[PDB]
């Protein structure tokens, strides 16, 4: 026995275990539980006082016995063995290979919590990423280094949207292709298999790293999975110079695992039983994105979450939206109308679009037409609502136009198809065609120099 | 006997420990580190602890360096006939730069319930001077008759008009108005003050003025 083993388990409650008569244990230290059958389970020190330690077990505490099970403290935090050979390989939620491929000797081991980027060392993200999806490129622009999640719902095609983004995304310069780091968190085989099949069909699998926690894997492992994935991503980006696109789904499963631990520890809850530190904990993931001055690489995050009961005020989408740099919201109403992708632009947002667009980056008309399209669509939806309650006759002649604008905007602009890749030029041109439906005097968001040059 | 034992402060509420002989609803005084005095009321008393509400709020109070004094009686108003013509704030302190009232007696501001057997039924006309009230909804001496209004409606002007015109036809020089302003704006307060002063209604009135900018727990005491 290289490491001292303790048979001093004194409490086993769900994922929680208490261990007595210990010494030299540290907060967040990695532990291993050895059982009589020889199974090895891993865990993490949640707190230490005097000679006692509280630990959370990743694989659960089933079968654990005070006499049969021994605990050993490894003297370091949970780390990921990183290496360039991880590209093209598939791992489980704890970073162990699961593809029956060749063994991998890590270049080095990195604490999966990582470190905070010094704010003054950051390079502000401003490189337009052409996803080829108009509702995003034009109205909720993605830039390289951003964290921009998809907010969705059960039964909605968020996996199709995410795979289309990964398939079509490119900066307009001569940069190398994105390396993709994919984290599966509590999702079904079929959800995970959709991504696998798309990555293999395009060949993206050859430039991808995948960390697979599935719905049959222990729920507490979900808490380590995105930290494993972000540690690989930051290593590939800042140590190897790659542009990394991180896709993580489903973050609702992540927060529910956090709540499982929090509830077992009997912490005092915030709203809906979620821990008071849910915001801070989520931020330690989503802030691991961006660019660093003097470094060539980057980390772009597309987290994906399902809003419980389609409610955006639920703590999980709510606190995520307080952290991330916008959000792309899918709705069931647009999805039942056959709009693909079913993006509702009205509650969607990108916070980094101003410096990534305009003359020299996309085109000079980008910001003004974006603002005008958004305003007209808002008025048009309002007219449509009034026509539902009061009939078409109730609408005024101008509001009849806006209702028709909103209809064409959804059917022809947003609804482009999951295998359609529009250039930013085609997107901007399509915008002017819709704006041409409206009277020119209604285009208050656009100055005359642009109107005279682009309006048909 | 001053206690340096304030335990915690929650909004307008304050907890005091190691107290003895304290009574429910007893008046208290907080001596702050800056030396100002804030009055309050015992809401709950148990064992050696007392829970109090501070009318002026707890902002700016350093409880470790402030002391509490229990005064041995409920909150009272020093009443005198000289209150006619005077303007007070929500806590009964002079607001018109006039002299302090010399009270004839002090009265628990909760008052007491009138024995139903001792009650006389409301009788006799009060002329408000407003046709819709006087004719169709006549105000009678001793009645409670409220005005239900809404924000932006002119209940301000109606209140001033009734204060200004109300009279009894039966008697001379025995009619007085007591006006209580609760959470009103500065402009609303300006309006009531000038109206009472310019017409002389102030000379038969007593005014208690709590403004929106004032501490809001004062409002509990103001109508009482």
């Amino acid at each position: 026995g290289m490491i001292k083993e303790y048979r001093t388990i004194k409490e086993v409650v769900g994922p929680l275990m208490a261990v007595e008569k210990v010494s030299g244990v540290k907060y967040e230290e990695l532990i291993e539980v050895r059982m009589q059958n020889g199974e090895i389970r891993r865990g993490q020190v949640l707190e230490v006082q005097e000679d006692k330690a509280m630990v959370q077990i990743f694989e659960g505490t089933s079968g654990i016995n005070y006499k049969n099970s021994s605990v050993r403290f490894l003297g370091h935090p949970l780390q990921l063995g990183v290496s360039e050979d991880m590209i093209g390989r598939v791992f489980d939620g704890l970073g162990r290979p699961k593809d029956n491929g060749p063994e991998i000797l890590p270049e080095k081991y990195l604490d999966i919590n990582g470190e905070v980027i010094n704010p003054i060392a950051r390079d502000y993200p401003d490189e337009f990423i052409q996803t080829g999806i108009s509702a995003i490129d034009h109205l909720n622009t993605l830039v390289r280094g951003q964290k921009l999640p998809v907010f969705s719902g059960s039964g909605l095609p968020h996996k199709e949207l995410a795979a289309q983004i990964a398939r079509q995304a490119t900066v307009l310069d001569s940069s190398d292709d994105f390396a993709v780091v994919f984290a599966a968190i509590g999702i079904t085989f079929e959800e995970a298999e959709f991504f696998m099949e798309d990555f293999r069909q395009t060949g993206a699998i050859d430039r991808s790293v995948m960390f697979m926690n599935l719905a049959n894997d222990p729920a507490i492992e979900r808490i380590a999975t995105p930290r494993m994935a972000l540690t690989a991503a930051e290593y590939l980006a800042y140590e190897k110079g790659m542009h990394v696109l991180v896709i993580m789904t489903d973050m609702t499963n992540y927060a529910e695992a956090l709540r499982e631990i929090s509830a077992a520890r009997r912490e005092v809850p915030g709203r809906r039983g979620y821990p008071g530190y849910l915001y801070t904990n989520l931020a330690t993931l989503f802030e691991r994105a961006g660019r660093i001055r003097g470094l060539k690489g980057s980390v772009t995050q597309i987290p994906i979450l399902t809003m419980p009961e389609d409610d955006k005020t639920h703590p999980i989408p709510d606190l995520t939206g307080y952290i991330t740099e916008g959000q792309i919201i899918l709705t069931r109403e647009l999805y039942k109308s056959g709009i693909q992708p079913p993006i509702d632009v009205l509650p969607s947002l990108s916070r980094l679009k101003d410096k990534g667009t305009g003359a020299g980056k996309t085109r000079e008309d980008h910001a003004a037409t974006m603002n005008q399209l958004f305003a007209a669509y808002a008025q048009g939806k309002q007219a449509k609502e009034l026509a539902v309650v009061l009939g078409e006759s109730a609408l005024s002649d101008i509001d009849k136009i806006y209702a028709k604008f909103a209809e064409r905007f959804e059917n022809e602009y947003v609804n482009q198809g999951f295998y359609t890749n529009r250039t930013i030029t085609e997107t901007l041109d399509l915008g002017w065609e819709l704006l041409a439906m409206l009277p020119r005097t209604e285009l208050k968001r656009i100055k005359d120099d642009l109107l005279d040059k682009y309006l048909p | 006997k001053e206690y340096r034992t304030i335990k915690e402060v929650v909004g307008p509420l304050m907890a005091v420990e190691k107290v003895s002989g304290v009574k429910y609803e007893e008046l208290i005084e907080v001596r702050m580190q800056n030396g100002e005095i804030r009055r309050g009321q015992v809401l709950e008393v148990q064992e050696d602890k007392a829970m109090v509400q501070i009318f002026e709020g707890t902002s700016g109070i350093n409880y470790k360096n402030s002391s509490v004094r229990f005064l041995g009686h409920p909150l009272q108003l020093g009443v005198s006939e000289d209150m006619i013509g005077r303007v007070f704030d929500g806590l009964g302190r002079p607001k018109d730069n006039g002299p302090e009232i010399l009270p004839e007696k002090y009265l628990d501001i909760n008052g007491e319930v009138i024995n139903p057997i001792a009650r006389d039924y409301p009788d006799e006309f009060i002329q408000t001077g407003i046709s819709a009230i006087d004719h169709l909804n006549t105000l009678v001496r001793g009645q409670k008759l409220p005005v239900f209004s809404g924000s932006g409606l002119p209940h301000k002007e109606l209140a001033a008009q009734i204060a200004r015109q109300a009279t009894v036809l039966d008697s001379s020089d025995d009619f007085a108005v007591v006006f209580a302003a609760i959470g009103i704006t500065f402009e609303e307060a300006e309006f009531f003050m000038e109206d009472f002063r310019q017409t002389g209604a102030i000379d038969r009135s007593v005014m208690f003025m709590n403004l929106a900018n004032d501490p809001a727990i004062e409002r509990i005491a103001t109508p009482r």
């Binding site: 010494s23 030299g24 540290k26 907060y27 967040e28 230290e29 707190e47 230490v48 006082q49 000679d51 935090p77 470190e115 905070v116 980027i117 010094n118 003054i120 060392a121 390079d123 502000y124 993200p125 800042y238 912490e267 005092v268 915030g270 709203r271 008071g276 530190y277 915001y279 801070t280 931020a283 330690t284 802030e287 961006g290 660093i292 001055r293 005020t313 639920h314 709510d318 952290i323 009205l346 101003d354 910001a367 603002n371 958004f374 305003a375 808002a378 008025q379 309650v389 009061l390 005024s396 005097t441 208050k444 | 915690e8 402060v9 929650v10 707890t58 902002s59 109070i61 500065f186 402009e187």
Partner: protein, 587 residues
């Protein structure tokens, strides 16, 4: 020196025994790594310590050393234009010293440059009697700001010797003769951040700040020395509001506290402000700005430190006679740190788990804002204007951080997600918002403008309030029922909303509106409504008036883009409205 021993580590909380010689508020070096923490409770020899750095890898048996000093700031030349973390470590020097792009721990760094030479200009004669706040000289720290060197609190006596020259902030520049002997002064003073810097007298904050944001200055103004909160849902525009005020408000100095928010937002400020330069003046916004950054994924307890570090630096410049704006984005993140520590301390929780002292911590912070007479014989005035974002879960303003804040602040800019979702920015709900300074500001504006501004504001809000009533009538009985006068009210209300309230912070001209331009824009909007109502009474029809005024209503809608130098084009619209309407009624 006494060495303590860690007995417990739980996230940001560390407990240590054998600390009987230490006291509450002492800073500590915790564990083998010597991470930086502060004692927040003392029971016998056992200290509860709030650690301002990551505590992963620390456990019982490790040493703890108290420095014997409270959490403090260095105040002196070299503070302006810096970006500090939450405990005033300069972030640029942090990078240079650790040679890393990431934040390590245990790094002790002086806040200011102690070797830089500054020119100290002595302005007081030897033999002069001085006390706290008296100015003995100054340093031209930036082109914008003259850094006044004040006698520190606790010092009183006679100036024995002083002279101008080049010095570091460590060099004695002045000898004062006190009752307790000779004392030397430097250009630098230290101050414990949990204690408000003393003043002579608090005053009523009654001078309106010019934020340049039309809806705020006009309908919900804040005064110099006032306190405003901006609660709103995510994406509603709190940070943009605070950036607009930090960029354009007519204060002397801005302190921006990034409390538990995004790292890129601080990156943006520190890179953009050195580039925002008035061409004639040649001065950048960074030359009047101090930045405190503790991002959302930085140590959670350092969110509290960042708030007190910011307000203390604000007070120091207030004491020099300056007007200061302190922006806290966002105070909800501070409240979350208090809730986290309260739970680790196993205290009894309050509403939503926040500690019972949450309200009084917030009150204590806003008590430090305000307009003051500062210490010193010149009895000069200064002020701190506190602008705080609140981030209520789900936008529910009935939650405890918002409600406790609204109990003590005077101004509520309530952001509204439905306005944000029609791209109506700033998303301030003009029905629910309020400013308790409105009446006094209106009277001040009337006097300083020599114009009846207060009645224009009252009329603007009256029209907006009628629109709310009319909108309800429209749903209940249809748009057709409304009289021509009602339709006109809806047109003017829409003009206030789209031509005046809506203001794009990313437009080169819309981003800022001077007091003078605001007056002219609001006058022409209201002038159209009055002239149009006059036409209606003379028998014209609403549709006839609308059809005949397309060109002039278009000038109204674009008056927000008129340059500040060309204000006559806005006021000339008044004449055009009157002549166009006069033609229409004359038929």
């Amino acid at each position: 020196m006494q060495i303590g021993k860690i007995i417990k580590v739980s996230g940001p909380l560390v407990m240590a025994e054998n600390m009987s010689e230490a006291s509450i508020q002492d800073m500590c070096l915790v564990g083998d790594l010597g991470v930086i923490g502060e004692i927040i409770e003392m029971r016998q020899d056992v200290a509860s310590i709030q650690v301002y750095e990551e505590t992963s890898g620390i456990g019982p048996g490790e040493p703890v050393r108290s420095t014997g000093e409270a959490l403090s700031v260095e105040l002196g030349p070299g503070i302006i234009s810096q970006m500090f973390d939450g405990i005033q470590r300069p972030l640029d020097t942090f990078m240079e010293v650790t040679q890393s792009n990431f934040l390590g721990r245990g790094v002790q760094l002086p806040a200011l440059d102690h070797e830089k030479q500054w020119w100290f200009e002595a302005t007081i004669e030897e033999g002069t009697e001085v006390s706290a706040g008296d100015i003995i000289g100054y340093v031209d720290e930036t082109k914008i700001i003259q850094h006044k060197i004040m006698v520190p609190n606790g010092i009183k006596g006679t100036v024995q010797k002083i002279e101008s020259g080049s010095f570091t902030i460590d060099d004695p520049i002045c000898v004062i003769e006190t009752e307790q002997g000779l004392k030397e002064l430097t250009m630098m003073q230290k101050w414990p951040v949990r204690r408000g810097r003393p003043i002579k007298q608090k005053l009523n904050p009654d001078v309106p700040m010019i934020t340049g944001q039309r809806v705020i200055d006009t309908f919900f103004p804040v005064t110099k020395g006032g306190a405003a909160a901006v609660p709103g849902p995510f994406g509603a525009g709190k940070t943009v509001v605070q950036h607009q005020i930090a960029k354009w408000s007519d204060v002397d100095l801005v302190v921006y506290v990034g409390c538990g928010e995004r790292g890129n937002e601080m990156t943006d400020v520190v890179n953009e402000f050195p580039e925002l330069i008035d061409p004639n003046t040649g001065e950048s916004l960074m030359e009047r700005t101090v930045l405190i950054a503790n991002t959302s994924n930085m140590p959670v307890a350092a969110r509290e430190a960042s708030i007190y570090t910011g307000i203390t630096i604000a007070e120091y410049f207030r004491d020099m006679g300056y007007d200061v704006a302190i922006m806290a984005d966002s105070t909800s993140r501070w409240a979350e740190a208090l809730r986290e520590m309260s739970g680790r301390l196993e205290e009894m929780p309050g509403d939503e788990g926040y500690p019972a002292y949450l309200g009084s911590r917030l009150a204590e912070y806003y008590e430090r804002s305000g307009r003051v007479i500062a210490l010193g014989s010149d009895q000069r005035e200064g002020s701190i204007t506190a602008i705080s974002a609140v981030s209520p879960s789900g936008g529910d303003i009935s939650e405890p951080v918002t409600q406790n804040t609204l109990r003590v602040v005077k101004v509520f800019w309530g952001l509204d997600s439905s306005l944000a979702q029609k791209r109506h920015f700033p998303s301030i709900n003009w029905i629910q918002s309020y400013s308790l300074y409105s009446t006094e500001v209106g009277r001040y504006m009337d006097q300083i403008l020599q114009q009846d501004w207060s009645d224009m504001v009252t009329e603007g809000m009256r029209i907006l309030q009628e629109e709310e009533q009319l909108n309800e009538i429209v749903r209940l009985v249809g748009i057709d029922s409304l009289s021509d006068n009602d339709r006109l009210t809806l047109e003017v209300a829409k003009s206030i909303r789209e031509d005046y309230l809506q203001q794009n912070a990313f437009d080169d001209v819309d981003t800022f509106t001077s007091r003078e331009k605001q007056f002219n824009m609001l006058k022409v909007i209201l002038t159209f409504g009055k002239e149009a109502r006059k036409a209606l009474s003379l028998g014209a029809y609403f549709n006839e008036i609308m059809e005949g005024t397309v060109a002039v209503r278009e000038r109204i809608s674009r008056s927000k883009y008129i340059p500040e130098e060309e204000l006559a084009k806005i006021s000339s619209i008044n004449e055009e409205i009157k002549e166009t309407i006069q033609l229409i009624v004359s038929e």
